[PDB]
Protein backbone atom coordinates (compact mmCIF):
# COMPACT_ATOMS: atom_id res chain seq x y z
CA UNK A 1 0.00 0.00 0.00
CA UNK A 2 1.01 3.59 -0.78
CA UNK A 3 -0.57 7.03 -0.65
CA UNK A 4 -0.51 9.24 -3.72
CA UNK A 5 -1.23 12.87 -3.07
CA UNK A 6 -2.99 14.66 -5.92
CA UNK A 7 -2.83 18.33 -6.83
CA UNK A 8 -5.40 19.11 -4.14
CA UNK A 9 -4.80 17.55 -0.76
CA UNK A 10 -5.17 19.80 2.21
CA UNK A 11 -2.45 18.14 4.23
CA UNK A 12 -4.68 15.10 4.33
CA UNK A 13 -2.30 12.98 2.26
CA UNK A 14 0.61 13.80 4.59
CA UNK A 15 -1.20 13.24 7.87
CA UNK A 16 -2.80 10.03 6.55
CA UNK A 17 0.77 8.91 5.84
CA UNK A 18 1.77 9.35 9.50
CA UNK A 19 -1.45 7.91 10.94
CA UNK A 20 -1.35 4.79 8.76
CA UNK A 21 2.44 4.58 8.44
CA UNK A 22 2.24 4.16 4.68
CA UNK A 23 4.76 5.72 2.30
CA UNK A 24 3.76 9.01 0.64
CA UNK A 25 4.22 9.70 -3.08
CA UNK A 26 3.34 13.19 -4.36
CA UNK A 27 1.96 13.72 -7.89
CA UNK A 28 3.92 16.21 -10.01
CA UNK A 29 1.57 18.87 -11.30
CA UNK A 30 1.80 22.23 -13.07
CA UNK A 31 -0.30 24.54 -15.25
CA UNK A 32 0.67 25.03 -18.89
CA UNK A 33 0.49 28.59 -20.28
CA UNK A 34 -2.59 27.24 -22.12
CA UNK A 35 -4.43 26.89 -18.84
CA UNK A 36 -4.29 23.09 -19.12
CA UNK A 37 -3.07 20.71 -16.45
CA UNK A 38 0.19 18.79 -16.44
CA UNK A 39 0.10 15.51 -14.51
CA UNK A 40 2.94 13.07 -13.67
CA UNK A 41 2.95 10.10 -11.23
CA UNK A 42 6.61 10.05 -10.16
CA UNK A 43 7.18 6.53 -8.79
CA UNK A 44 6.87 2.87 -9.59
CA UNK A 45 3.55 1.37 -8.54
CA UNK A 46 3.56 -1.78 -10.69
CA UNK A 47 1.54 -3.91 -8.24
CA UNK A 48 0.89 -1.54 -5.31
CA UNK A 49 -2.49 -0.82 -3.73
CA UNK A 50 -3.02 2.92 -4.01
CA UNK A 51 -4.69 5.48 -1.81
CA UNK A 52 -5.25 8.55 -3.95
CA UNK A 53 -6.01 11.79 -2.10
CA UNK A 54 -7.68 14.38 -4.35
CA UNK A 55 -10.22 16.81 -3.06
CA UNK A 56 -12.37 18.67 -5.54
CA UNK A 57 -12.92 22.07 -3.91
CA UNK A 58 -12.51 25.29 -5.96
CA UNK A 59 -11.59 25.11 -8.78
CA UNK A 60 -13.95 22.11 -9.05
CA UNK A 61 -13.69 21.51 -12.79
CA UNK A 62 -9.90 21.54 -12.98
CA UNK A 63 -9.61 19.43 -9.82
CA UNK A 64 -12.09 16.96 -11.27
CA UNK A 65 -10.27 16.70 -14.57
CA UNK A 66 -6.97 16.39 -12.73
CA UNK A 67 -8.61 13.59 -10.69
CA UNK A 68 -9.68 11.80 -13.87
CA UNK A 69 -6.17 12.12 -15.38
CA UNK A 70 -4.32 11.01 -12.27
CA UNK A 71 -6.68 8.09 -11.83
CA UNK A 72 -6.19 6.68 -15.37
CA UNK A 73 -2.42 7.20 -15.15
CA UNK A 74 -2.38 5.18 -11.87
CA UNK A 75 -4.39 2.30 -13.37
CA UNK A 76 -2.17 2.52 -16.47
CA UNK A 77 0.94 2.30 -14.34
CA UNK A 78 -0.03 -1.16 -13.07
CA UNK A 79 -1.55 -0.41 -9.65
CA UNK A 80 -3.43 -3.36 -8.10
CA UNK A 81 -6.26 -1.31 -6.61
CA UNK A 82 -7.23 2.35 -6.75
CA UNK A 83 -8.87 3.95 -3.74
CA UNK A 84 -9.92 7.52 -4.37
CA UNK A 85 -10.13 9.61 -1.21
CA UNK A 86 -11.95 12.74 -2.31
CA UNK A 87 -12.75 14.71 0.86
CA UNK A 88 -15.07 17.18 -0.80
CA UNK A 89 -16.87 15.70 -3.78
CA UNK A 90 -18.01 18.43 -6.20
CA UNK A 91 -21.40 18.54 -7.96
CA UNK A 92 -22.95 16.92 -4.89
CA UNK A 93 -25.69 19.48 -4.50
CA UNK A 94 -26.98 18.30 -7.91
CA UNK A 95 -28.77 15.18 -6.68
CA UNK A 96 -31.56 14.77 -9.26
CA UNK A 97 -33.55 16.57 -11.95
CA UNK A 98 -35.18 19.49 -10.12
CA UNK A 99 -36.64 20.56 -13.48
CA UNK A 100 -37.03 18.44 -16.62
CA UNK A 101 -33.85 18.23 -18.70
CA UNK A 102 -31.55 19.32 -15.89
CA UNK A 103 -28.34 17.30 -15.68
CA UNK A 104 -27.81 14.93 -12.83
CA UNK A 105 -24.22 16.15 -12.46
CA UNK A 106 -23.25 13.78 -9.68
CA UNK A 107 -24.32 10.81 -11.78
CA UNK A 108 -21.96 11.77 -14.62
CA UNK A 109 -19.08 12.50 -12.28
CA UNK A 110 -19.55 9.17 -10.52
CA UNK A 111 -19.92 7.12 -13.68
CA UNK A 112 -16.73 8.81 -14.96
CA UNK A 113 -14.83 7.65 -11.86
CA UNK A 114 -15.72 3.94 -12.41
CA UNK A 115 -14.52 4.21 -15.98
CA UNK A 116 -11.07 5.75 -15.44
CA UNK A 117 -10.36 2.98 -12.91
CA UNK A 118 -11.38 3.95 -9.37
CA UNK A 119 -12.17 0.81 -7.38
CA UNK A 120 -13.09 2.28 -4.02
CA UNK A 121 -14.43 5.79 -3.42
CA UNK A 122 -14.10 7.51 0.02
CA UNK A 123 -16.07 10.71 0.64
CA UNK A 124 -16.57 12.91 3.69
CA UNK A 125 -20.18 14.15 4.30
CA UNK A 126 -21.63 13.66 0.83
CA UNK A 127 -24.55 16.10 0.61
CA UNK A 128 -26.96 13.12 0.35
CA UNK A 129 -25.49 9.58 0.60
CA UNK A 130 -27.99 7.96 -1.82
CA UNK A 131 -26.21 9.97 -4.52
CA UNK A 132 -23.26 7.66 -4.30
CA UNK A 133 -25.29 4.64 -5.43
CA UNK A 134 -24.45 5.73 -8.98
CA UNK A 135 -20.82 4.76 -8.34
CA UNK A 136 -20.33 1.14 -9.29
CA UNK A 137 -17.38 0.23 -7.07
CA UNK A 138 -17.11 0.07 -3.29
CA UNK A 139 -18.33 3.01 -1.16
CA UNK A 140 -16.88 4.24 2.13
CA UNK A 141 -18.72 7.24 3.54
CA UNK A 142 -17.01 9.22 6.35
CA UNK A 143 -19.04 11.16 8.94
CA UNK A 144 -16.50 13.03 11.10
CA UNK A 145 -19.09 13.58 13.84
CA UNK A 146 -16.94 12.54 16.82
CA UNK A 147 -14.23 15.05 15.86
CA UNK A 148 -16.81 17.82 15.58
CA UNK A 149 -18.35 16.78 18.87
CA UNK A 150 -14.96 16.78 20.63
CA UNK A 151 -14.19 20.30 19.25
CA UNK A 152 -17.54 21.79 20.16
CA UNK A 153 -17.04 20.48 23.72
CA UNK A 154 -13.66 22.15 24.03
CA UNK A 155 -14.83 25.51 22.75
CA UNK A 156 -18.44 25.79 23.82
CA UNK A 157 -19.59 25.99 27.41
CA UNK A 158 -23.21 24.75 27.64
CA UNK A 159 -23.89 23.81 23.97
CA UNK A 160 -27.26 23.68 22.29
CA UNK A 161 -27.08 22.04 18.86
CA UNK A 162 -29.36 23.57 16.24
CA UNK A 163 -29.94 22.12 12.74
CA UNK A 164 -31.08 24.71 10.09
CA UNK A 165 -33.59 22.31 8.45
CA UNK A 166 -34.88 18.77 8.74
CA UNK A 167 -32.07 17.79 6.40
CA UNK A 168 -29.45 18.60 9.02
CA UNK A 169 -31.34 16.93 11.91
CA UNK A 170 -29.74 13.47 11.76
CA UNK A 171 -26.31 15.07 11.79
CA UNK A 172 -27.19 17.44 14.68
CA UNK A 173 -28.67 14.57 16.66
CA UNK A 174 -25.72 12.23 16.26
CA UNK A 175 -23.34 15.06 17.21
CA UNK A 176 -25.42 16.29 20.15
CA UNK A 177 -26.05 12.78 21.51
CA UNK A 178 -22.36 11.97 21.74
CA UNK A 179 -21.78 15.13 23.73
CA UNK A 180 -25.08 14.73 25.66
CA UNK A 181 -26.27 18.15 24.57
CA UNK A 182 -29.83 19.25 23.76
CA UNK A 183 -30.67 19.54 20.06
CA UNK A 184 -33.44 20.78 17.82
CA UNK A 185 -34.20 21.81 14.25
CA UNK A 186 -35.87 24.74 12.52
CA UNK A 187 -39.14 23.87 10.78
CA UNK A 188 -39.76 25.43 7.39
CA UNK A 189 -43.39 25.46 6.19
CA UNK A 190 -45.03 28.74 7.19
CA UNK A 191 -36.06 21.97 22.63
CA UNK A 192 -36.69 25.70 21.85
CA UNK A 193 -35.47 26.18 25.42
CA UNK A 194 -32.25 27.29 23.75
CA UNK A 195 -33.07 30.32 25.86
CA UNK A 196 -29.78 31.54 27.38
CA UNK A 197 -27.71 28.72 25.83
CA UNK A 198 -24.63 28.78 23.56
CA UNK A 199 -26.11 27.62 20.24
CA UNK A 200 -24.13 25.81 17.55
CA UNK A 201 -25.71 25.65 14.09
CA UNK A 202 -24.44 22.63 12.14
CA UNK A 203 -24.81 21.96 8.40
CA UNK A 204 -22.98 19.77 5.87
CA UNK A 205 -22.03 22.74 3.65
CA UNK A 206 -21.85 26.52 4.00
CA UNK A 207 -21.63 28.44 0.72
CA UNK A 208 -23.32 31.83 0.71
CA UNK A 209 -24.31 31.40 4.35
CA UNK A 210 -27.97 32.14 3.70
CA UNK A 211 -29.48 29.23 5.62
CA UNK A 212 -27.12 29.85 8.54
CA UNK A 213 -28.03 33.55 8.68
CA UNK A 214 -31.79 32.93 8.79
CA UNK A 215 -31.07 30.38 11.52
CA UNK A 216 -28.93 32.79 13.53
CA UNK A 217 -31.98 35.14 13.73
CA UNK A 218 -34.37 32.65 15.29
CA UNK A 219 -31.59 31.75 17.75
CA UNK A 220 -31.05 35.28 19.07
CA UNK A 221 -34.80 35.93 18.98
CA UNK A 222 -35.09 32.91 21.28
CA UNK A 223 -32.54 33.99 23.85
CA UNK A 224 -29.35 32.52 22.39
CA UNK A 225 -26.46 33.65 24.55
CA UNK A 226 -24.23 33.21 21.52
CA UNK A 227 -24.30 31.60 18.08
CA UNK A 228 -21.50 29.53 16.58
CA UNK A 229 -21.66 28.01 13.10
CA UNK A 230 -20.12 24.70 12.00
CA UNK A 231 -19.99 22.75 8.73
CA UNK A 232 -17.90 19.92 7.34
CA UNK A 233 -17.37 21.75 4.02
CA UNK A 234 -16.74 25.47 4.40
CA UNK A 235 -17.00 26.82 0.82
CA UNK A 236 -17.35 30.44 1.92
CA UNK A 237 -18.46 32.40 -1.12
CA UNK A 238 -17.88 36.12 -1.53
CA UNK A 239 -19.78 37.79 1.30
CA UNK A 240 -20.27 34.71 3.47
CA UNK A 241 -17.62 35.28 6.14
CA UNK A 242 -18.64 38.91 6.63
CA UNK A 243 -22.38 38.36 6.04
CA UNK A 244 -22.13 36.05 9.08
CA UNK A 245 -20.09 38.26 11.43
CA UNK A 246 -22.71 40.97 10.79
CA UNK A 247 -25.57 38.80 12.11
CA UNK A 248 -23.30 37.99 15.03
CA UNK A 249 -21.86 34.56 14.37
CA UNK A 250 -18.81 34.73 16.62
CA UNK A 251 -16.97 31.55 15.74
CA UNK A 252 -16.72 29.44 12.58
CA UNK A 253 -15.90 25.73 12.64
CA UNK A 254 -14.95 23.79 9.53
CA UNK A 255 -12.69 21.04 8.31
CA UNK A 256 -9.86 20.50 5.84
CA UNK A 257 -11.95 18.90 3.14
CA UNK A 258 -11.64 22.42 1.76
CA UNK A 259 -8.92 25.08 1.72
CA UNK A 260 -9.39 28.10 4.08
CA UNK A 261 -7.97 30.99 6.27
CA UNK A 262 -7.35 31.70 9.99
CA UNK A 263 -8.87 34.92 11.39
CA UNK A 264 -10.81 32.18 12.88
CA UNK A 265 -11.49 29.78 11.23
CA UNK A 266 -11.36 26.78 13.51
CA UNK A 267 -10.19 24.04 11.19
CA UNK A 268 -10.58 20.38 12.09
CA UNK A 269 -8.16 17.98 10.35
CA UNK A 270 -10.49 15.08 9.49
CA UNK A 271 -7.73 12.69 8.49
CA UNK A 272 -8.22 10.75 11.72
CA UNK A 273 -11.90 10.18 10.78
CA UNK A 274 -10.97 9.18 7.24
CA UNK A 275 -8.37 6.65 8.52
CA UNK A 276 -10.93 4.74 10.56
CA UNK A 277 -13.18 4.31 7.54
CA UNK A 278 -10.44 2.80 5.37
CA UNK B 1 -32.27 15.84 -36.53
CA UNK B 2 -31.66 18.83 -34.26
CA UNK B 3 -28.73 20.96 -33.19
CA UNK B 4 -28.07 21.55 -29.52
CA UNK B 5 -25.79 24.45 -28.73
CA UNK B 6 -23.69 23.95 -25.63
CA UNK B 7 -22.28 26.57 -23.29
CA UNK B 8 -19.40 27.21 -25.71
CA UNK B 9 -20.32 27.54 -29.36
CA UNK B 10 -18.76 30.45 -31.20
CA UNK B 11 -21.75 31.09 -33.39
CA UNK B 12 -21.09 27.70 -34.92
CA UNK B 13 -24.36 26.19 -33.65
CA UNK B 14 -26.38 29.07 -35.14
CA UNK B 15 -24.70 29.16 -38.52
CA UNK B 16 -24.81 25.36 -38.76
CA UNK B 17 -28.56 25.71 -38.21
CA UNK B 18 -28.94 28.00 -41.24
CA UNK B 19 -26.56 25.99 -43.45
CA UNK B 20 -28.21 22.64 -42.74
CA UNK B 21 -31.70 23.99 -42.11
CA UNK B 22 -32.06 22.05 -38.88
CA UNK B 23 -33.83 23.45 -35.81
CA UNK B 24 -31.60 24.95 -33.10
CA UNK B 25 -32.06 24.23 -29.39
CA UNK B 26 -29.85 26.15 -26.94
CA UNK B 27 -28.68 24.58 -23.65
CA UNK B 28 -29.54 26.60 -20.54
CA UNK B 29 -26.38 27.14 -18.55
CA UNK B 30 -25.27 29.24 -15.58
CA UNK B 31 -22.59 29.31 -12.90
CA UNK B 32 -23.57 28.67 -9.28
CA UNK B 33 -21.95 30.89 -6.62
CA UNK B 34 -19.95 27.72 -5.79
CA UNK B 35 -18.17 27.96 -9.12
CA UNK B 36 -20.00 24.86 -10.34
CA UNK B 37 -21.87 24.55 -13.62
CA UNK B 38 -25.63 24.39 -14.07
CA UNK B 39 -26.84 22.51 -17.15
CA UNK B 40 -30.36 22.08 -18.55
CA UNK B 41 -31.48 20.71 -21.96
CA UNK B 42 -34.68 22.70 -22.55
CA UNK B 43 -36.61 20.67 -25.13
CA UNK B 44 -37.99 17.26 -25.88
CA UNK B 45 -35.61 15.04 -27.81
CA UNK B 46 -37.18 11.65 -27.14
CA UNK B 47 -36.11 10.05 -30.45
CA UNK B 48 -34.20 12.83 -32.21
CA UNK B 49 -30.71 12.59 -33.73
CA UNK B 50 -28.64 15.26 -32.04
CA UNK B 51 -25.80 17.47 -33.19
CA UNK B 52 -24.15 18.85 -30.07
CA UNK B 53 -21.91 21.87 -30.56
CA UNK B 54 -19.45 22.31 -27.66
CA UNK B 55 -15.98 23.71 -28.15
CA UNK B 56 -13.49 23.26 -25.35
CA UNK B 57 -11.36 26.41 -25.54
CA UNK B 58 -10.51 28.34 -22.34
CA UNK B 59 -11.63 27.47 -19.76
CA UNK B 60 -10.87 23.94 -20.99
CA UNK B 61 -11.69 22.07 -17.79
CA UNK B 62 -15.08 23.65 -17.19
CA UNK B 63 -16.01 23.34 -20.87
CA UNK B 64 -15.01 19.68 -20.81
CA UNK B 65 -17.03 18.94 -17.70
CA UNK B 66 -19.95 20.85 -19.20
CA UNK B 67 -19.54 18.72 -22.30
CA UNK B 68 -19.63 15.54 -20.21
CA UNK B 69 -22.74 16.72 -18.33
CA UNK B 70 -24.64 17.87 -21.41
CA UNK B 71 -23.75 14.65 -23.23
CA UNK B 72 -25.13 12.29 -20.56
CA UNK B 73 -28.24 14.45 -20.14
CA UNK B 74 -28.90 14.18 -23.89
CA UNK B 75 -28.50 10.40 -23.90
CA UNK B 76 -30.66 10.24 -20.76
CA UNK B 77 -33.38 12.30 -22.43
CA UNK B 78 -33.89 9.61 -25.08
CA UNK B 79 -31.91 10.94 -28.08
CA UNK B 80 -31.36 8.38 -30.88
CA UNK B 81 -27.81 9.40 -31.71
CA UNK B 82 -25.36 11.87 -30.23
CA UNK B 83 -22.91 13.63 -32.52
CA UNK B 84 -20.51 15.84 -30.61
CA UNK B 85 -19.08 18.66 -32.67
CA UNK B 86 -16.17 19.95 -30.65
CA UNK B 87 -14.33 22.50 -32.83
CA UNK B 88 -11.29 22.79 -30.57
CA UNK B 89 -10.61 19.62 -28.59
CA UNK B 90 -8.60 20.37 -25.42
CA UNK B 91 -5.68 18.27 -24.19
CA UNK B 92 -4.73 17.53 -27.79
CA UNK B 93 -1.11 18.55 -27.40
CA UNK B 94 -0.80 15.67 -24.91
CA UNK B 95 -0.45 12.89 -27.47
CA UNK B 96 1.66 10.32 -25.60
CA UNK B 97 3.97 9.79 -22.61
CA UNK B 98 6.86 12.18 -23.28
CA UNK B 99 8.32 11.04 -19.95
CA UNK B 100 7.47 7.88 -17.97
CA UNK B 101 4.36 8.24 -15.83
CA UNK B 102 3.05 11.30 -17.67
CA UNK B 103 -0.68 11.16 -18.35
CA UNK B 104 -1.96 10.59 -21.86
CA UNK B 105 -4.63 13.25 -21.28
CA UNK B 106 -6.27 12.94 -24.68
CA UNK B 107 -6.82 9.22 -24.08
CA UNK B 108 -8.72 9.86 -20.85
CA UNK B 109 -10.80 12.64 -22.37
CA UNK B 110 -11.69 10.47 -25.37
CA UNK B 111 -12.52 7.40 -23.32
CA UNK B 112 -14.74 9.61 -21.18
CA UNK B 113 -16.68 10.77 -24.25
CA UNK B 114 -17.53 7.19 -25.32
CA UNK B 115 -18.83 6.47 -21.85
CA UNK B 116 -21.20 9.43 -21.38
CA UNK B 117 -22.83 8.57 -24.69
CA UNK B 118 -21.16 10.32 -27.66
CA UNK B 119 -21.63 8.20 -30.78
CA UNK B 120 -19.88 10.34 -33.35
CA UNK B 121 -17.09 12.83 -32.65
CA UNK B 122 -16.38 15.75 -35.02
CA UNK B 123 -13.14 17.72 -34.56
CA UNK B 124 -11.47 20.52 -36.49
CA UNK B 125 -7.67 20.21 -37.00
CA UNK B 126 -6.86 17.78 -34.21
CA UNK B 127 -3.21 18.37 -33.27
CA UNK B 128 -2.38 14.83 -34.45
CA UNK B 129 -5.20 12.72 -35.98
CA UNK B 130 -3.86 9.37 -34.68
CA UNK B 131 -4.82 10.66 -31.23
CA UNK B 132 -8.47 10.16 -32.05
CA UNK B 133 -8.08 6.39 -32.44
CA UNK B 134 -8.66 6.20 -28.68
CA UNK B 135 -12.27 7.26 -29.27
CA UNK B 136 -14.41 4.17 -29.78
CA UNK B 137 -17.26 5.65 -31.85
CA UNK B 138 -17.21 7.15 -35.34
CA UNK B 139 -14.67 9.86 -36.22
CA UNK B 140 -15.13 12.79 -38.56
CA UNK B 141 -12.04 14.99 -38.84
CA UNK B 142 -12.47 18.43 -40.45
CA UNK B 143 -9.60 20.16 -42.25
CA UNK B 144 -10.83 23.63 -43.19
CA UNK B 145 -8.04 24.04 -45.76
CA UNK B 146 -10.19 25.38 -48.61
CA UNK B 147 -11.56 28.19 -46.46
CA UNK B 148 -8.07 29.22 -45.39
CA UNK B 149 -6.86 29.06 -48.98
CA UNK B 150 -9.77 31.24 -50.16
CA UNK B 151 -9.00 33.84 -47.45
CA UNK B 152 -5.26 33.94 -48.06
CA UNK B 153 -5.97 34.55 -51.77
CA UNK B 154 -8.26 37.49 -50.99
CA UNK B 155 -5.82 39.18 -48.62
CA UNK B 156 -2.38 38.23 -49.87
CA UNK B 157 -0.95 39.36 -53.19
CA UNK B 158 1.75 36.88 -54.26
CA UNK B 159 1.64 34.36 -51.37
CA UNK B 160 4.43 32.07 -50.28
CA UNK B 161 3.27 29.46 -47.77
CA UNK B 162 5.75 28.59 -45.03
CA UNK B 163 5.36 25.76 -42.51
CA UNK B 164 7.25 26.28 -39.20
CA UNK B 165 8.30 22.62 -38.94
CA UNK B 166 7.93 19.33 -40.81
CA UNK B 167 4.78 18.79 -38.74
CA UNK B 168 3.03 21.66 -40.50
CA UNK B 169 4.21 20.68 -43.99
CA UNK B 170 1.26 18.53 -45.11
CA UNK B 171 -1.12 21.33 -44.11
CA UNK B 172 0.96 24.00 -45.90
CA UNK B 173 1.22 21.88 -49.03
CA UNK B 174 -2.51 21.11 -49.22
CA UNK B 175 -3.32 24.81 -48.71
CA UNK B 176 -0.67 26.11 -51.13
CA UNK B 177 -1.47 23.57 -53.85
CA UNK B 178 -5.11 24.62 -53.92
CA UNK B 179 -4.11 28.21 -54.47
CA UNK B 180 -1.15 27.29 -56.73
CA UNK B 181 1.31 29.08 -54.48
CA UNK B 182 4.90 28.03 -53.65
CA UNK B 183 5.47 26.36 -50.29
CA UNK B 184 8.31 25.25 -48.05
CA UNK B 185 9.14 24.28 -44.50
CA UNK B 186 11.78 25.24 -41.93
CA UNK B 187 14.15 22.40 -41.05
CA UNK B 188 15.09 22.00 -37.39
CA UNK B 189 18.25 19.97 -36.65
CA UNK B 190 21.24 22.32 -36.43
CA UNK B 191 11.60 27.01 -52.22
CA UNK B 192 13.73 29.41 -50.10
CA UNK B 193 13.13 31.77 -53.03
CA UNK B 194 10.61 33.38 -50.72
CA UNK B 195 12.86 36.32 -51.51
CA UNK B 196 10.57 39.32 -52.07
CA UNK B 197 7.36 37.34 -51.50
CA UNK B 198 4.45 37.86 -49.08
CA UNK B 199 4.96 34.95 -46.69
CA UNK B 200 2.16 33.24 -44.76
CA UNK B 201 3.19 31.02 -41.86
CA UNK B 202 0.59 28.33 -41.17
CA UNK B 203 0.29 26.09 -38.08
CA UNK B 204 -2.52 24.16 -36.41
CA UNK B 205 -2.24 26.03 -33.12
CA UNK B 206 -0.74 29.31 -31.95
CA UNK B 207 -0.38 29.62 -28.16
CA UNK B 208 2.62 31.60 -26.98
CA UNK B 209 3.61 32.27 -30.57
CA UNK B 210 7.16 31.06 -30.07
CA UNK B 211 7.41 28.84 -33.14
CA UNK B 212 5.83 31.54 -35.29
CA UNK B 213 8.29 34.15 -34.04
CA UNK B 214 11.40 32.10 -34.80
CA UNK B 215 9.90 31.43 -38.23
CA UNK B 216 9.19 35.13 -38.85
CA UNK B 217 12.95 35.77 -38.44
CA UNK B 218 14.14 33.35 -41.12
CA UNK B 219 11.48 34.83 -43.39
CA UNK B 220 12.66 38.43 -43.10
CA UNK B 221 16.28 37.28 -43.20
CA UNK B 222 15.43 35.68 -46.54
CA UNK B 223 13.83 38.68 -48.18
CA UNK B 224 10.22 38.30 -47.13
CA UNK B 225 8.32 41.38 -48.28
CA UNK B 226 5.86 40.75 -45.44
CA UNK B 227 4.92 38.03 -42.96
CA UNK B 228 1.38 36.94 -42.10
CA UNK B 229 0.54 34.24 -39.56
CA UNK B 230 -2.38 31.82 -39.77
CA UNK B 231 -3.65 28.99 -37.60
CA UNK B 232 -6.88 27.06 -37.17
CA UNK B 233 -6.81 27.42 -33.36
CA UNK B 234 -5.67 30.85 -32.16
CA UNK B 235 -5.20 30.37 -28.40
CA UNK B 236 -3.24 33.59 -27.99
CA UNK B 237 -1.61 33.42 -24.58
CA UNK B 238 -0.56 36.51 -22.64
CA UNK B 239 2.12 38.19 -24.74
CA UNK B 240 1.41 36.37 -28.02
CA UNK B 241 -0.48 39.07 -29.93
CA UNK B 242 2.07 41.75 -29.02
CA UNK B 243 5.10 39.45 -29.11
CA UNK B 244 4.17 38.91 -32.78
CA UNK B 245 3.51 42.53 -33.79
CA UNK B 246 6.98 43.30 -32.42
CA UNK B 247 8.68 40.85 -34.80
CA UNK B 248 6.59 42.37 -37.58
CA UNK B 249 3.72 39.99 -38.15
CA UNK B 250 1.25 42.35 -39.79
CA UNK B 251 -1.87 40.23 -40.06
CA UNK B 252 -3.30 37.36 -38.02
CA UNK B 253 -5.64 34.73 -39.47
CA UNK B 254 -7.61 32.35 -37.30
CA UNK B 255 -10.98 30.63 -37.07
CA UNK B 256 -13.95 30.40 -34.73
CA UNK B 257 -13.03 27.10 -33.14
CA UNK B 258 -11.85 29.54 -30.46
CA UNK B 259 -13.16 32.85 -29.06
CA UNK B 260 -11.18 36.03 -30.03
CA UNK B 261 -10.98 39.85 -30.73
CA UNK B 262 -10.92 42.22 -33.74
CA UNK B 263 -8.01 44.70 -33.90
CA UNK B 264 -7.34 42.25 -36.55
CA UNK B 265 -7.94 39.37 -36.08
CA UNK B 266 -9.17 37.91 -39.34
CA UNK B 267 -11.64 35.28 -38.20
CA UNK B 268 -12.82 32.56 -40.55
CA UNK B 269 -16.16 30.94 -39.67
CA UNK B 270 -15.43 27.27 -40.33
CA UNK B 271 -19.06 26.13 -40.01
CA UNK B 272 -19.18 25.66 -43.79
CA UNK B 273 -16.23 23.22 -43.59
CA UNK B 274 -17.81 21.39 -40.64
CA UNK B 275 -21.10 21.03 -42.56
CA UNK B 276 -19.49 19.17 -45.45
CA UNK B 277 -17.94 16.66 -43.09
CA UNK B 278 -21.23 15.73 -41.40
N1 LIG C 1 -23.21 24.16 -6.56
C1 LIG C 1 -24.42 24.66 -6.23
N2 LIG C 1 -24.58 25.86 -5.60
C2 LIG C 1 -25.79 26.36 -5.27
N3 LIG C 1 -26.94 25.70 -5.54
C3 LIG C 1 -26.93 24.48 -6.17
C4 LIG C 1 -25.64 23.89 -6.55
N4 LIG C 1 -25.89 22.70 -7.13
C5 LIG C 1 -27.24 22.54 -7.13
N5 LIG C 1 -27.86 23.59 -6.55
C6 LIG C 1 -29.33 23.77 -6.38
O1 LIG C 1 -29.75 23.62 -5.02
C7 LIG C 1 -31.05 23.04 -4.97
C8 LIG C 1 -31.07 21.96 -3.91
O2 LIG C 1 -30.95 22.55 -2.61
P1 LIG C 1 -29.79 22.06 -1.60
O3 LIG C 1 -29.19 20.86 -2.29
O4 LIG C 1 -30.54 21.71 -0.34
O5 LIG C 1 -28.87 23.25 -1.49
C9 LIG C 1 -31.37 22.48 -6.35
O6 LIG C 1 -32.54 23.13 -6.87
C10 LIG C 1 -30.14 22.76 -7.20
O7 LIG C 1 -30.50 23.25 -8.50
N1 LIG D 1 -1.49 22.59 -23.36
C1 LIG D 1 -0.15 22.57 -23.58
N2 LIG D 1 0.57 23.72 -23.67
C2 LIG D 1 1.90 23.71 -23.91
N3 LIG D 1 2.62 22.58 -24.07
C3 LIG D 1 2.02 21.35 -23.99
C4 LIG D 1 0.56 21.28 -23.75
N4 LIG D 1 0.22 19.97 -23.74
C5 LIG D 1 1.36 19.27 -23.95
N5 LIG D 1 2.43 20.08 -24.12
C6 LIG D 1 3.84 19.66 -24.36
O1 LIG D 1 4.27 19.91 -25.70
C7 LIG D 1 5.17 18.88 -26.13
C8 LIG D 1 4.80 18.42 -27.53
O2 LIG D 1 5.06 19.47 -28.46
P1 LIG D 1 3.90 19.98 -29.45
O3 LIG D 1 2.79 18.98 -29.24
O4 LIG D 1 4.54 19.91 -30.82
O5 LIG D 1 3.60 21.39 -28.97
C9 LIG D 1 5.08 17.73 -25.13
O6 LIG D 1 6.36 17.50 -24.54
C10 LIG D 1 4.04 18.16 -24.10
O7 LIG D 1 4.43 17.88 -22.75
Curated annotation (Swiss-Prot), chains A, B:
Chain positions recorded as D-ribose 5-phosphate binding sites: 190, 203, 207-211
Extent of the signal sequence: none
Pathway recorded for this protein: Metabolic intermediate biosynthesis; 5-phospho-alpha-D-ribose 1-diphosphate biosynthesis; 5-phospho-alpha-D-ribose 1-diphosphate from D-ribose 5-phosphate (route I): step 1/1
List of residues binding Mg(2+) 2: 165
Disulfide bonds: none
Keywords associated with the record: ATP-binding, Cytoplasm, Kinase, Magnesium, Metal-binding, Nucleotide biosynthesis, Nucleotide-binding, Transferase
Binding site residues for ATP: 34-36, 93-94
Cofactor(s) required, per the database record: Mg(2+)
UniProt feature coiled coil, ranges: none
A GO BP entry: purine nucleotide biosynthetic process
Subcellular location, principal: cytoplasm
UniProt subcellular location: Cytoplasm
Complex formation: Homodimer.
UniProt protein name: Ribose-phosphate pyrophosphokinase
Organism, as annotated: Saccharolobus solfataricus (strain ATCC 35092 / DSM 1617 / JCM 11322 / P2) (Sulfolobus solfataricus)
Taxonomy of the source species: Archaea, Thermoproteota, Thermoprotei, Sulfolobales, Sulfolobaceae
Amino acid sequence: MIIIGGSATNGIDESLSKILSIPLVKVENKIFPDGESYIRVPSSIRDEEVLLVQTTDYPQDKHLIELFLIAETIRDLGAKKLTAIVPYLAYSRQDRRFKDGEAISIKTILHILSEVGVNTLVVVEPHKPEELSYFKGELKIVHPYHQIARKIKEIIEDPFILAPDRGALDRARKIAEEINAPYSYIEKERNINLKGKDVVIIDDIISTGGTIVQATRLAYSLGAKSVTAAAIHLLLVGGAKERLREVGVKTLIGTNTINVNDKDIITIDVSQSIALSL
